[PDB]
Structure formats: C-alpha cells, structure tokens
C-alpha cells in the first residue's frame, strides 16, 4: 500500500543521506 | 582516533546492509 | 512506466551491493 | 591504513551520491 511503502522509501532515502554524511566524515578525517 | 574511525565505518556498513534488506521489501506498485 | 521504475530499482540494488563490497574492502585494508 | 586509501574513499562517496540521486527519482504507484 502506498502509505506503508512510502514510509519505507522515505526512510531508505534518509538512511542513504546519513551514509553520505558519515562517509564524508570518514573521508575528511582519514 | 582510529577507534572513532572504526566505529564509524562499522555503523556505515551496518546501515548499508540494512538498506540492502529494505530495498528487497520495497514494492513499487502495491 | 512501471518498467522504468523496476529498472531503476534493479540498478540501485546493484549499486548498493557494490558499495557494500567496497566498504568491506576499505575495512579489510584499514 | 585509513591514511592510504583516499582513492577508494572517493569512489565510495561518488557512488553513495549516485544512489542518493536515484533514490530521489524512484516513484511508487506510477
């Protein structure tokens, strides 16, 4: 259903954004 | 510190595995 | 179209697996 | 080490950004 899958997709998108910022932190500090 | 880097990379890898599993649950039309 | 989106999801899943393997390679060489 | 892997760090960061953009392009129930 749209709602439940939209909540899943929105979560995945923000988890990817968190990984982006975490990887940037890791690289900058390396 | 190296421990800070390790813990950060550990979480990144956990989060990537979580996204990998979540994307197998996503139904584009439902 | 559904086919456009299914293609996109398949590409994303392949890309996620690649980053998983590369993050592991990074750790193995750390 | 974490100090001799800039090229791989850069690759991972590029690939995470590419996934981010693709995730933002996904459409449900289209």
Curated annotation (Swiss-Prot), chains A, B, C, D:
From the Swiss-Prot or TrEMBL record, state where the protein is found.
Nucleus; Nucleus membrane; Nucleus, Nuclear pore complex; Nucleus envelope
Q: How does it get modified post-translation? A: Polyubiquitinated by PRKN, which leads to proteasomal degradation.
Disease field reads:
Encephalopathy, acute, infection-induced, 3: A rapidly progressive encephalopathy manifesting in susceptible individuals with seizures and coma. It can occur within days in otherwise healthy children after common viral infections such as influenza and parainfluenza, without evidence of viral infection of the brain or inflammatory cell infiltration. Brain T2-weighted magnetic resonance imaging reveals characteristic symmetric lesions present in the thalami, pons and brainstem.
Q: What does this protein do?
A: E3 SUMO-protein ligase which facilitates SUMO1 and SUMO2 conjugation by UBE2I. Involved in transport factor (Ran-GTP, karyopherin)-mediated protein import via the F-G repeat-containing domain which acts as a docking site for substrates. Binds single-stranded RNA (in vitro). May bind DNA. Component of the nuclear export pathway. Specific docking site for the nuclear export factor exportin-1. Inhibits EIF4E-dependent mRNA export. Sumoylates PML at 'Lys-490' which is essential for the proper assembly of PML-NB.
The UniProt entry's sequence similarity note says:
Belongs to the RanBP2 E3 ligase family.
| Domain remarks | Contains FG repeats. FG repeats are interaction sites for karyopherins (importins, exportins) and form probably an affinity gradient, guiding the transport proteins unidirectionally with their cargo through the NPC. FG repeat regions are highly flexible and lack ordered secondary structure. The overall conservation of FG repeats regarding exact sequence, spacing, and repeat unit length is limited.
Tell me how this protein assembles: Part of the nuclear pore complex. Forms a complex with NXT1, NXF1 and RANGAP1. Forms a tight complex with RANBP1 and UBE2I. Interacts with SUMO1 but not SUMO2. Interacts with PRKN. Interacts with sumoylated RANGAP1. Interacts with CDCA8. Interacts with PML (isoform PML-4). Interacts with BICD2. Interacts with MCM3AP isoform GANP. Interacts with COX11. Interacts with synaptic plasticity regulator PANTS. (Microbial infection) Interacts with HIV-1 Vpu protein; this interaction allows Vpu to down-regulate BLM sumoylation.
Name the record gives this protein: E3 SUMO-protein ligase RanBP2
What species was this sequence derived from? Homo sapiens
């Amino acid at each position: 259903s749209y709602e439940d899958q939209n909540s899943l997709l929105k979560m995945i998108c923000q988890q990817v954004e968190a990984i982006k910022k975490e990887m940037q932190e890791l690289k900058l500090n390396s």
